[PDB]
């Protein structure tokens, strides 16, 4: 089975840089295509027959290669180029897994906000503690929960957004779900964000016994 | 000009069947080879089936193993894909695509139609206001939220004050929790404007035909 692999799976660069991404085949093939995808929309033809640009594709893009190795190249990258690029060829069942190009920008620390479980959820017998970490960069960030002074790892679910289309920041939710009875057994809840913008964490907390 | 419009997707139990349609416009549909491509939840893209312009040449992807049947009706400018004995691995977004020349790039794609294979049943979501309460804030800005828990299938759409609060919104991607979806949405407004000016989240779940509004009220301590 002729198979495609793509490298790197993820890269990031400031606008103005040169960008290159590789698509490899298990055995020699020809006439490689490349498709661009952005969140919520269909894949779009970008490069075809190894070197031809689809309509509406700026001449900063170029495709090349032969044999078992091909590549897509962008000169003087612009923010709109951010997307996932997938290679594919006429004898291939599975598309390559794609390179995701993201926009590099200045580091930013997160705006952190903590929300105690709603009385309505508590009425139902569930208790979700929600902590938002918004408008930060880079994407790699670490969140820690402490309950009455001890770290907790079970019952946490974290969800990042796609890189923001206007300012290239990331946001993420971190949610601690507990049963109502387990929530009622503790008092101090703390959400900490540790980022490479500072060695000292950002910290938000509350006591359940208040309000 | 050129348009491809898919339909017929939905929820389906394992072992069942489903027929997907792709309506075409803007070109001489009978002159072009057509294909179906599917994208899995892992974003993997797989070539499912191909059919020549005349309906007399057909190919299938490696895992299809006879359970898929591609066909077309050039008189009604429509392409179909018949699915049978569906499995959990067949869950994906299914796309209708058109071919340009005989190196088989796909020069136009449809909007996609989603197929979900599981035993889960449609379930409306619960919606919970997120006021600060015991975690009161003190800056020029305040951040509020809504928790949306326990729905199936995806998606829900979230808005704030009917989309009049657009700036300062983050609606996080959903995650499966007890095999039901959950997400939260946050909004940031000047603290001088709340609670004096009302803030409401608008949750819509088309598949259950539910629409709920949760006013964000300050907690009664
Ligand atoms: C160019 C090709 C063979 C020559 C032809 O008249 C038309 C096509 C288009 C559809 C292609 C096909 C073969 O390459 C095998 C493919 C890729 C198939 C789509 C699914 C496929 O059957 C496979 O996935 C086999 O692995």
CSV table of C-alpha atoms and ligand atoms in Angstrom, one decimal:
chain,number,residue,atom,x,y,z
A,1,UNK,CA,0.0,0.0,0.0
A,2,UNK,CA,1.7,3.2,-1.1
A,3,UNK,CA,1.5,5.5,1.9
A,4,UNK,CA,2.1,9.2,2.6
A,5,UNK,CA,3.6,10.8,5.7
A,6,UNK,CA,4.0,14.5,6.3
A,7,UNK,CA,6.5,16.5,8.3
A,8,UNK,CA,6.4,18.5,10.6
A,9,UNK,CA,2.9,17.8,12.0
A,10,UNK,CA,2.8,21.3,13.5
A,11,UNK,CA,5.0,24.4,12.9
A,12,UNK,CA,4.7,28.0,13.7
A,13,UNK,CA,6.4,31.1,12.3
A,14,UNK,CA,6.1,34.8,12.3
A,15,UNK,CA,4.8,36.5,9.2
A,16,UNK,CA,7.7,37.3,6.8
A,17,UNK,CA,9.5,33.9,7.2
A,18,UNK,CA,10.1,31.2,4.6
A,19,UNK,CA,8.1,28.1,5.3
A,20,UNK,CA,8.7,24.5,4.0
A,21,UNK,CA,6.8,21.3,4.6
A,22,UNK,CA,7.5,17.8,3.3
A,23,UNK,CA,5.3,14.9,2.1
A,24,UNK,CA,6.9,11.5,1.7
A,25,UNK,CA,5.8,8.4,-0.2
A,26,UNK,CA,6.6,4.7,0.7
A,27,UNK,CA,7.4,4.3,-3.0
A,28,UNK,CA,7.9,6.5,-6.1
A,29,UNK,CA,4.7,8.2,-7.5
A,30,UNK,CA,4.0,11.4,-9.5
A,31,UNK,CA,1.6,14.4,-9.9
A,32,UNK,CA,1.2,15.3,-6.2
A,33,UNK,CA,-1.6,17.5,-5.0
A,34,UNK,CA,-2.0,19.7,-1.9
A,35,UNK,CA,-5.2,20.7,-0.1
A,36,UNK,CA,-5.6,23.6,2.4
A,37,UNK,CA,-8.1,23.3,5.3
A,38,UNK,CA,-9.3,25.9,7.8
A,39,UNK,CA,-11.6,25.2,10.8
A,40,UNK,CA,-15.2,24.7,10.0
A,41,UNK,CA,-14.8,24.6,6.2
A,42,UNK,CA,-14.1,22.1,3.4
A,43,UNK,CA,-10.7,21.3,2.0
A,44,UNK,CA,-9.7,23.4,-0.9
A,45,UNK,CA,-7.4,22.6,-3.8
A,46,UNK,CA,-4.2,24.7,-3.5
A,47,UNK,CA,-1.4,23.0,-5.5
A,48,UNK,CA,-2.0,20.3,-8.1
A,49,UNK,CA,0.1,18.1,-10.5
A,50,UNK,CA,3.1,18.8,-8.2
A,51,UNK,CA,3.6,22.4,-9.3
A,52,UNK,CA,0.5,24.1,-10.7
A,53,UNK,CA,-1.2,26.7,-8.5
A,54,UNK,CA,-5.0,26.5,-8.2
A,55,UNK,CA,-7.0,29.6,-8.9
A,56,UNK,CA,-6.7,32.3,-6.3
A,57,UNK,CA,-3.4,31.0,-4.8
A,58,UNK,CA,-0.7,33.7,-4.4
A,59,UNK,CA,2.6,33.2,-6.2
A,60,UNK,CA,4.3,33.1,-2.8
A,61,UNK,CA,3.3,29.4,-2.8
A,62,UNK,CA,5.2,26.8,-4.8
A,63,UNK,CA,5.2,23.0,-5.0
A,64,UNK,CA,8.0,20.7,-6.1
A,65,UNK,CA,9.5,17.2,-5.8
A,66,UNK,CA,9.7,13.8,-7.5
A,67,UNK,CA,10.1,10.2,-6.6
A,68,UNK,CA,9.4,9.6,-3.0
A,69,UNK,CA,9.7,13.2,-1.7
A,70,UNK,CA,7.7,16.3,-2.3
A,71,UNK,CA,7.4,19.7,-0.5
A,72,UNK,CA,5.3,22.8,-0.3
A,73,UNK,CA,7.0,26.1,0.2
A,74,UNK,CA,5.8,29.6,1.2
A,75,UNK,CA,7.9,32.8,0.8
A,76,UNK,CA,7.3,35.8,3.1
A,77,UNK,CA,4.5,34.1,4.9
A,78,UNK,CA,1.3,36.1,5.6
A,79,UNK,CA,-1.3,35.5,8.4
A,80,UNK,CA,-4.0,34.2,6.0
A,81,UNK,CA,-1.7,31.3,5.1
A,82,UNK,CA,-2.4,29.7,8.5
A,83,UNK,CA,-4.2,26.4,7.9
A,84,UNK,CA,-3.6,22.7,7.6
A,85,UNK,CA,-2.0,21.5,4.4
A,86,UNK,CA,-2.6,17.8,3.3
A,87,UNK,CA,-0.9,16.0,0.5
A,88,UNK,CA,-2.6,13.4,-1.7
A,89,UNK,CA,-2.0,11.5,-4.9
A,90,UNK,CA,-4.1,9.5,-7.4
A,91,UNK,CA,-3.1,6.0,-6.1
A,92,UNK,CA,-3.4,6.8,-2.4
A,93,UNK,CA,-6.2,5.7,-0.1
A,94,UNK,CA,-5.4,7.8,3.0
A,95,UNK,CA,-4.4,11.4,2.7
A,96,UNK,CA,-1.3,12.4,4.4
A,97,UNK,CA,-2.0,13.5,8.0
A,98,UNK,CA,-1.1,17.2,7.2
A,99,UNK,CA,1.1,20.0,8.5
A,100,UNK,CA,-0.7,22.6,10.6
A,101,UNK,CA,0.9,26.1,10.2
A,102,UNK,CA,0.3,28.5,13.0
A,103,UNK,CA,1.2,32.2,13.6
A,104,UNK,CA,3.9,33.0,16.0
A,105,UNK,CA,3.4,36.2,18.1
A,106,UNK,CA,4.6,37.9,21.3
A,107,UNK,CA,4.2,36.0,24.6
A,108,UNK,CA,1.1,36.8,26.6
A,109,UNK,CA,0.0,35.7,30.1
A,110,UNK,CA,-3.6,34.4,30.6
A,111,UNK,CA,-6.5,36.2,32.1
A,112,UNK,CA,-7.7,33.6,34.7
A,113,UNK,CA,-11.3,33.4,36.1
A,114,UNK,CA,-12.8,30.8,38.5
A,115,UNK,CA,-16.5,29.9,38.8
A,116,UNK,CA,-18.0,27.9,41.6
A,117,UNK,CA,-20.7,25.3,40.8
A,118,UNK,CA,-24.1,26.8,40.0
A,119,UNK,CA,-27.0,26.2,42.5
A,120,UNK,CA,-28.9,24.8,39.5
A,121,UNK,CA,-26.3,22.1,38.8
A,122,UNK,CA,-26.1,21.4,42.5
A,123,UNK,CA,-29.9,20.9,42.5
A,124,UNK,CA,-29.4,18.1,39.9
A,125,UNK,CA,-26.6,16.4,41.9
A,126,UNK,CA,-23.6,17.4,39.9
A,127,UNK,CA,-20.8,20.0,40.7
A,128,UNK,CA,-18.6,21.5,38.0
A,129,UNK,CA,-15.9,24.0,38.9
A,130,UNK,CA,-15.0,26.0,35.8
A,131,UNK,CA,-11.7,28.0,35.3
A,132,UNK,CA,-11.1,30.0,32.1
A,133,UNK,CA,-7.6,30.9,30.9
A,134,UNK,CA,-8.0,33.5,28.1
A,135,UNK,CA,-5.9,35.4,25.6
A,136,UNK,CA,-2.5,33.8,26.2
A,137,UNK,CA,0.6,32.7,24.1
A,138,UNK,CA,2.3,30.4,23.6
A,139,UNK,CA,-0.4,27.6,23.5
A,140,UNK,CA,1.6,25.3,25.8
A,141,UNK,CA,0.3,26.1,29.3
A,142,UNK,CA,-0.1,24.1,32.5
A,143,UNK,CA,-3.1,24.2,34.8
A,144,UNK,CA,-3.1,22.8,38.4
A,145,UNK,CA,-6.0,22.3,40.8
A,146,UNK,CA,-5.6,22.3,44.6
A,147,UNK,CA,-8.4,21.2,47.0
A,148,UNK,CA,-7.8,22.2,50.6
A,149,UNK,CA,-4.1,22.4,50.0
A,150,UNK,CA,-3.5,19.2,48.0
A,151,UNK,CA,-3.1,18.6,44.3
A,152,UNK,CA,-6.0,16.9,42.4
A,153,UNK,CA,-5.7,15.2,39.0
A,154,UNK,CA,-8.8,13.1,38.5
A,155,UNK,CA,-12.0,14.6,37.0
A,156,UNK,CA,-10.2,17.4,35.1
A,157,UNK,CA,-10.9,18.1,31.4
A,158,UNK,CA,-9.0,20.8,29.4
A,159,UNK,CA,-10.1,22.3,26.0
A,160,UNK,CA,-8.2,24.8,23.9
A,161,UNK,CA,-9.7,26.9,21.2
A,162,UNK,CA,-8.1,27.3,17.7
A,163,UNK,CA,-5.6,30.1,17.4
A,164,UNK,CA,-7.6,33.4,17.5
A,165,UNK,CA,-8.3,34.8,14.1
A,166,UNK,CA,-7.8,38.4,15.2
A,167,UNK,CA,-4.9,38.4,17.7
A,168,UNK,CA,-3.4,34.9,17.4
A,169,UNK,CA,-3.9,34.2,21.1
A,170,UNK,CA,-5.1,30.9,22.5
A,171,UNK,CA,-7.8,30.4,25.2
A,172,UNK,CA,-8.6,27.2,27.2
A,173,UNK,CA,-11.1,26.0,29.7
A,174,UNK,CA,-10.2,23.7,32.6
A,175,UNK,CA,-13.2,22.0,34.3
A,176,UNK,CA,-13.3,20.0,37.5
A,177,UNK,CA,-16.4,17.8,37.6
A,178,UNK,CA,-17.3,16.2,40.9
A,179,UNK,CA,-20.4,14.6,42.4
A,180,UNK,CA,-22.3,17.0,44.6
A,181,UNK,CA,-21.5,15.0,47.7
A,182,UNK,CA,-17.7,15.1,46.9
A,183,UNK,CA,-18.0,18.8,46.3
A,184,UNK,CA,-19.7,19.4,49.6
A,185,UNK,CA,-16.8,17.7,51.5
A,186,UNK,CA,-14.2,20.3,50.8
A,187,UNK,CA,-13.9,24.1,51.1
A,188,UNK,CA,-10.9,25.7,49.4
A,189,UNK,CA,-10.8,25.3,45.6
A,190,UNK,CA,-7.9,26.7,43.6
A,191,UNK,CA,-7.0,27.0,39.9
A,192,UNK,CA,-3.3,27.8,39.0
A,193,UNK,CA,-1.9,28.7,35.6
A,194,UNK,CA,1.9,28.2,35.1
A,195,UNK,CA,3.1,29.7,31.8
A,196,UNK,CA,6.5,30.6,30.4
A,197,UNK,CA,5.6,34.3,30.6
A,198,UNK,CA,6.5,34.1,34.4
A,199,UNK,CA,8.0,31.7,36.9
A,200,UNK,CA,5.3,32.6,39.4
A,201,UNK,CA,1.8,31.2,38.8
A,202,UNK,CA,-1.5,33.1,38.3
A,203,UNK,CA,-3.9,31.9,41.0
A,204,UNK,CA,-7.7,32.2,41.5
A,205,UNK,CA,-9.6,30.6,44.4
A,206,UNK,CA,-12.8,30.6,46.5
A,207,UNK,CA,-14.2,29.0,49.6
A,208,UNK,CA,-17.4,26.9,49.0
A,209,UNK,CA,-18.6,28.0,52.5
A,210,UNK,CA,-18.9,31.6,51.3
A,211,UNK,CA,-22.1,32.6,49.5
B,1,UNK,CA,-21.3,29.4,-9.9
B,2,UNK,CA,-20.3,25.7,-9.3
B,3,UNK,CA,-22.2,24.3,-6.3
B,4,UNK,CA,-22.1,20.9,-4.6
B,5,UNK,CA,-24.7,20.4,-1.8
B,6,UNK,CA,-24.7,17.2,0.4
B,7,UNK,CA,-27.5,15.8,2.5
B,8,UNK,CA,-28.8,12.7,4.2
B,9,UNK,CA,-26.3,12.5,7.1
B,10,UNK,CA,-27.3,11.8,10.6
B,11,UNK,CA,-27.2,9.5,13.6
B,12,UNK,CA,-27.3,5.7,12.9
B,13,UNK,CA,-27.1,2.6,15.0
B,14,UNK,CA,-24.3,0.1,14.3
B,15,UNK,CA,-25.2,-2.4,11.6
B,16,UNK,CA,-27.6,0.1,9.9
B,17,UNK,CA,-27.6,1.8,6.5
B,18,UNK,CA,-27.7,5.3,5.1
B,19,UNK,CA,-28.0,6.9,1.7
B,20,UNK,CA,-26.1,10.2,1.1
B,21,UNK,CA,-26.9,12.6,-1.7
B,22,UNK,CA,-25.0,15.4,-3.5
B,23,UNK,CA,-26.9,17.9,-5.6
B,24,UNK,CA,-24.9,19.6,-8.3
B,25,UNK,CA,-25.4,22.9,-10.2
B,26,UNK,CA,-23.4,25.3,-12.4
B,27,UNK,CA,-21.6,22.8,-14.7
B,28,UNK,CA,-22.4,19.9,-17.1
B,29,UNK,CA,-22.6,17.3,-14.4
B,30,UNK,CA,-22.4,14.4,-16.8
B,31,UNK,CA,-18.9,15.3,-18.2
B,32,UNK,CA,-17.1,14.9,-14.9
B,33,UNK,CA,-15.8,12.1,-12.7
B,34,UNK,CA,-17.0,12.4,-9.1
B,35,UNK,CA,-15.8,11.2,-5.7
B,36,UNK,CA,-16.7,10.8,-2.0
B,37,UNK,CA,-14.1,11.7,0.6
B,38,UNK,CA,-14.6,11.4,4.3
B,39,UNK,CA,-12.9,13.0,7.3
B,40,UNK,CA,-12.7,11.1,10.6
B,41,UNK,CA,-12.9,12.7,14.1
B,42,UNK,CA,-9.1,12.5,14.1
B,43,UNK,CA,-9.2,14.8,10.9
B,44,UNK,CA,-7.9,11.9,8.8
B,45,UNK,CA,-9.0,12.0,5.1
B,46,UNK,CA,-9.9,8.8,3.3
B,47,UNK,CA,-10.9,8.3,-0.4
B,48,UNK,CA,-14.1,6.3,-0.1
B,49,UNK,CA,-15.4,5.9,-3.7
B,50,UNK,CA,-15.0,7.2,-7.3
B,51,UNK,CA,-17.3,7.1,-10.3
B,52,UNK,CA,-16.6,7.9,-13.9
B,53,UNK,CA,-18.7,10.4,-15.8
B,54,UNK,CA,-20.8,7.8,-17.5
B,55,UNK,CA,-21.5,5.7,-14.4
B,56,UNK,CA,-19.6,2.7,-15.9
B,57,UNK,CA,-16.3,3.0,-14.0
B,58,UNK,CA,-16.1,2.6,-10.2
B,59,UNK,CA,-13.4,2.3,-7.5
B,60,UNK,CA,-13.5,2.0,-3.7
B,61,UNK,CA,-11.2,2.6,-0.8
B,62,UNK,CA,-9.4,-0.2,1.0
B,63,UNK,CA,-11.7,-0.5,4.1
B,64,UNK,CA,-14.9,-0.3,2.2
B,65,UNK,CA,-14.9,-4.0,1.6
B,66,UNK,CA,-18.2,-4.1,-0.4
B,67,UNK,CA,-20.3,-2.2,2.1
B,68,UNK,CA,-20.4,1.0,0.1
B,69,UNK,CA,-22.1,1.6,-3.3
B,70,UNK,CA,-21.5,4.8,-5.3
B,71,UNK,CA,-24.0,5.8,-8.1
B,72,UNK,CA,-25.2,8.8,-10.0
B,73,UNK,CA,-28.2,10.1,-11.9
B,74,UNK,CA,-26.8,12.5,-14.6
B,75,UNK,CA,-30.4,13.5,-15.4
B,76,UNK,CA,-31.0,15.0,-12.0
B,77,UNK,CA,-27.4,16.2,-11.5
B,78,UNK,CA,-27.1,14.1,-8.3
B,79,UNK,CA,-24.4,11.8,-6.8
B,80,UNK,CA,-25.2,9.2,-4.2
B,81,UNK,CA,-23.4,6.9,-1.7
B,82,UNK,CA,-25.2,3.9,-0.2
B,83,UNK,CA,-23.8,2.8,3.1
B,84,UNK,CA,-24.7,-0.6,4.8
B,85,UNK,CA,-23.5,-2.6,7.8
B,86,UNK,CA,-22.1,0.6,9.3
B,87,UNK,CA,-19.5,0.4,12.0
B,88,UNK,CA,-18.1,2.9,14.6
B,89,UNK,CA,-15.1,3.5,12.3
B,90,UNK,CA,-17.4,4.8,9.6
B,91,UNK,CA,-18.2,7.9,11.6
B,92,UNK,CA,-16.9,10.9,9.7
B,93,UNK,CA,-17.8,14.1,7.7
B,94,UNK,CA,-18.6,12.9,4.1
B,95,UNK,CA,-17.7,15.2,1.2
B,96,UNK,CA,-18.8,15.3,-2.4
B,97,UNK,CA,-15.9,16.2,-4.8
B,98,UNK,CA,-15.4,16.8,-8.5
B,99,UNK,CA,-12.4,15.8,-10.7
B,100,UNK,CA,-10.5,18.2,-13.1
B,101,UNK,CA,-8.3,16.0,-15.4
B,102,UNK,CA,-6.9,12.5,-15.4
B,103,UNK,CA,-4.4,13.0,-12.5
B,104,UNK,CA,-7.5,13.1,-10.2
B,105,UNK,CA,-7.1,16.2,-8.2
B,106,UNK,CA,-10.4,17.4,-6.7
B,107,UNK,CA,-11.1,21.0,-7.8
B,108,UNK,CA,-14.4,21.6,-6.1
B,109,UNK,CA,-15.8,20.3,-2.8
B,110,UNK,CA,-19.2,20.4,-1.1
B,111,UNK,CA,-20.0,21.7,2.4
B,112,UNK,CA,-20.0,18.2,3.8
B,113,UNK,CA,-22.6,16.0,5.6
B,114,UNK,CA,-21.9,14.4,8.9
B,115,UNK,CA,-22.5,10.7,9.7
B,116,UNK,CA,-22.3,9.4,13.3
B,117,UNK,CA,-22.5,5.7,14.1
B,118,UNK,CA,-23.3,4.9,17.7
B,119,UNK,CA,-26.0,3.5,20.1
B,120,UNK,CA,-26.4,7.0,21.8
B,121,UNK,CA,-29.7,8.8,21.5
B,122,UNK,CA,-30.4,12.4,20.9
B,123,UNK,CA,-30.4,14.3,24.2
B,124,UNK,CA,-30.9,18.0,24.8
B,125,UNK,CA,-28.4,19.9,26.9
B,126,UNK,CA,-28.6,21.4,30.4
B,127,UNK,CA,-27.5,25.0,30.7
B,128,UNK,CA,-26.1,26.5,33.8
B,129,UNK,CA,-25.3,30.2,34.4
B,130,UNK,CA,-21.7,31.0,35.6
B,131,UNK,CA,-21.7,34.1,37.9
B,132,UNK,CA,-18.6,34.8,40.0
B,133,UNK,CA,-20.3,34.3,43.4
B,134,UNK,CA,-17.7,33.5,46.2
B,135,UNK,CA,-15.1,34.2,43.5
B,136,UNK,CA,-16.0,37.9,43.0
B,137,UNK,CA,-13.7,39.9,40.8
B,138,UNK,CA,-12.5,43.6,41.1
B,139,UNK,CA,-11.1,45.0,37.8
B,140,UNK,CA,-12.4,47.3,35.1
B,141,UNK,CA,-13.7,44.1,33.5
B,142,UNK,CA,-15.7,41.1,34.6
B,143,UNK,CA,-15.9,37.7,33.0
B,144,UNK,CA,-19.0,35.6,32.9
B,145,UNK,CA,-19.9,32.2,31.4
B,146,UNK,CA,-22.3,29.5,30.5
B,147,UNK,CA,-21.9,25.7,31.1
B,148,UNK,CA,-23.6,23.4,28.5
B,149,UNK,CA,-23.7,19.8,29.7
B,150,UNK,CA,-25.1,16.5,28.6
B,151,UNK,CA,-26.1,16.8,24.9
B,152,UNK,CA,-25.9,14.5,21.9
B,153,UNK,CA,-25.1,14.8,19.1
B,154,UNK,CA,-22.9,17.7,18.2
B,155,UNK,CA,-23.2,20.6,17.7
B,156,UNK,CA,-24.6,23.4,19.8
B,157,UNK,CA,-24.4,27.1,18.9
B,158,UNK,CA,-23.8,29.7,21.6
B,159,UNK,CA,-24.4,33.4,21.4
B,160,UNK,CA,-24.5,36.3,24.0
B,161,UNK,CA,-27.3,38.9,24.1
B,162,UNK,CA,-28.4,37.5,20.7
B,163,UNK,CA,-25.0,38.1,19.1
B,164,UNK,CA,-24.9,41.7,20.2
B,165,UNK,CA,-22.0,40.8,22.5
B,166,UNK,CA,-19.7,39.4,19.8
B,167,UNK,CA,-16.3,40.7,20.9
B,168,UNK,CA,-14.8,39.1,24.0
B,169,UNK,CA,-16.5,35.7,23.5
B,170,UNK,CA,-14.7,32.4,23.7
B,171,UNK,CA,-16.8,29.2,23.1
B,172,UNK,CA,-14.6,26.2,23.8
B,173,UNK,CA,-14.7,23.0,21.7
B,174,UNK,CA,-16.9,20.3,23.1
B,175,UNK,CA,-15.7,17.2,24.9
B,176,UNK,CA,-17.3,13.8,25.6
B,177,UNK,CA,-18.0,13.2,29.3
B,178,UNK,CA,-20.1,10.1,30.2
B,179,UNK,CA,-20.5,9.7,26.4
B,180,UNK,CA,-22.4,13.1,26.3
B,181,UNK,CA,-21.0,16.4,25.1
B,182,UNK,CA,-20.1,19.3,27.4
B,183,UNK,CA,-18.6,22.8,26.7
B,184,UNK,CA,-18.4,26.2,28.3
B,185,UNK,CA,-18.5,29.7,26.8
B,186,UNK,CA,-17.2,32.8,28.4
B,187,UNK,CA,-17.9,36.5,27.8
B,188,UNK,CA,-16.0,39.6,29.1
B,189,UNK,CA,-17.8,43.0,29.6
B,190,UNK,CA,-17.0,46.2,31.5
B,191,UNK,CA,-17.7,45.5,35.2
B,192,UNK,CA,-19.6,48.9,35.4
B,193,UNK,CA,-22.2,47.4,33.0
B,194,UNK,CA,-23.1,44.3,35.0
B,195,UNK,CA,-25.5,43.6,36.6
B,196,UNK,CA,-27.0,47.0,35.5
B,197,UNK,CA,-27.2,45.8,31.9
B,198,UNK,CA,-28.4,42.2,31.4
B,199,UNK,CA,-26.2,39.4,30.0
B,200,UNK,CA,-27.8,36.3,28.5
B,201,UNK,CA,-26.4,33.2,26.8
B,202,UNK,CA,-28.4,31.8,23.9
B,203,UNK,CA,-28.0,28.0,23.5
B,204,UNK,CA,-29.4,26.2,20.4
B,205,UNK,CA,-29.4,22.5,19.9
B,206,UNK,CA,-30.9,21.9,16.4
B,207,UNK,CA,-30.9,18.1,16.6
B,208,UNK,CA,-33.1,18.1,19.7
B,209,UNK,CA,-35.0,21.2,18.5
B,210,UNK,CA,-34.2,23.0,21.8
B,211,UNK,CA,-33.4,26.7,22.4
B,212,UNK,CA,-32.7,28.0,26.0
B,213,UNK,CA,-31.8,31.4,27.4
B,214,UNK,CA,-29.9,31.7,30.7
B,215,UNK,CA,-29.8,35.1,32.2
B,216,UNK,CA,-26.6,35.6,34.2
B,217,UNK,CA,-27.9,36.9,37.6
B,218,UNK,CA,-25.6,37.7,40.6
B,219,UNK,CA,-25.8,34.8,43.1
B,220,UNK,CA,-28.0,35.1,46.3
B,221,UNK,CA,-25.4,34.4,49.0
C,1,LIG,C1,-6.6,6.4,-10.2
C,1,LIG,C2,-7.8,5.4,-10.3
C,1,LIG,C3,-7.4,4.2,-11.2
C,1,LIG,C4,-7.5,4.6,-12.7
C,1,LIG,C5,-8.9,5.1,-13.0
C,1,LIG,O1,-9.5,4.8,-14.0
C,1,LIG,C6,-9.5,5.9,-12.0
C,1,LIG,C7,-9.0,6.1,-10.8
C,1,LIG,C8,-9.7,7.0,-9.8
C,1,LIG,C9,-10.0,6.3,-8.5
C,1,LIG,C10,-8.8,5.7,-7.9
C,1,LIG,C11,-8.1,4.8,-8.9
C,1,LIG,C12,-7.0,3.9,-8.3
C,1,LIG,O2,-5.8,4.6,-8.1
C,1,LIG,C13,-7.4,3.2,-6.9
C,1,LIG,C14,-8.0,4.2,-5.9
C,1,LIG,C15,-7.0,5.1,-5.3
C,1,LIG,C16,-9.2,4.9,-6.6
C,1,LIG,C17,-9.9,5.6,-5.5
C,1,LIG,C18,-9.9,4.5,-4.4
C,1,LIG,C19,-8.8,3.5,-4.8
C,1,LIG,O3,-9.4,2.3,-5.3
C,1,LIG,C20,-8.0,3.0,-3.6
C,1,LIG,O4,-8.0,3.5,-2.5
C,1,LIG,C21,-7.0,1.8,-3.9
C,1,LIG,O5,-6.1,1.7,-2.8
